[PDB]
Amino acid sequence: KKIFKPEELRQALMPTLEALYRQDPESLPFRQPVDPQLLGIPDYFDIVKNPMDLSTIKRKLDTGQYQEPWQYVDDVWLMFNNAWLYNRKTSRVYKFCSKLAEVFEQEIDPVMQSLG
Numbered sequence: 041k042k043i044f045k046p047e048e049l050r051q052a053l054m055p056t057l058e059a060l061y062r063q064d065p066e067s068l069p070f071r072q073p074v075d076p077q078l079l080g081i082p083d084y085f086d087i088v089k090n091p092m093d094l095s096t097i098k099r100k101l102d103t104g105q106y107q108e109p110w111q112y113v114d115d116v117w118l119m120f121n122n123a124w125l126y127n128r129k130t131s132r133v134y135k136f137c138s139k140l141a142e143v144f145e146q147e148i149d150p151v152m153q154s155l156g
């Protein structure tokens with residue numbers, strides 16, 4: 041397997057993470073972990089067993105917790121898939137999720153090609 045240095049993953053993938061953060065208001069529900077107590081949604085962790093958010097992805101990238109870049113891709117789609125699972129199709133959070141996913145799909149392709 042190709043060996044990836046944590047510093048190469050960080051420098052290569054951080055621009056793609058910024059592309060999600062800079063969407064405002066679209067990124068606002070995703071910047072911090074879902075807090076079901078605050079949001080009044082007691083069933084959240086009955087439905088979402090593996091939560092993920094931008095701050096967790098960013099910390100993992102900054103601290104070298106990804107061994108290979110598709111694990112970063114996995115966490116981003118887990119974030120989005122959790123939100124599409126939990127929220128109604130008509131809800132603002134669901135629509136903002138789809139907006140971020142389109143940005144991600146555009147940005148991630150050339151970066152992954154360059155890491156190969």
Ligand SMILES: CO[C@H]1CC[C@H](n2c([C@@H]3CCCC(=O)N3c3ccc(F)c(F)c3)nc3cc(-c4c(C)noc4C)ccc32)CC1
Nearest residue numbers: 065066068069070072074079081122123126127132133136
């Ligand atoms: C600490 O600052 C945060 C900002 C986002 C706030 N927020 C909000 C706020 C408060 C509640 C009412 C509302 O409409 N919100 C909101 C705020 C901004 C948005 F762009 C948006 F789509 C929704 N809704 C959130 C929903 C989710 C969510 C995700 C991701 N997946 O399932 C659920 C449920 C996550 C965060 C949400 C909560 C506090």
Ligand SMILES: Cc1cc(N2CCOCC2)cc2[nH]c(-c3c(NC[C@@H](O)c4cccc(Cl)c4)cc[nH]c3=O)nc12
Nearest residue numbers: 113114117118121137138141142145148149150152153
């Ligand atoms: C492109 C796309 C659009 C949407 N819709 C957007 C609008 O709202 C409705 C949903 C949902 C998606 N789910 C996934 C998805 C993954 N994709 C890999 C892809 O990024 C990828 C694949 C090969 C190379 C690269 Cl470089 C990148 C991987 C794991 N699990 C996933 O669920 N991709 C989706």
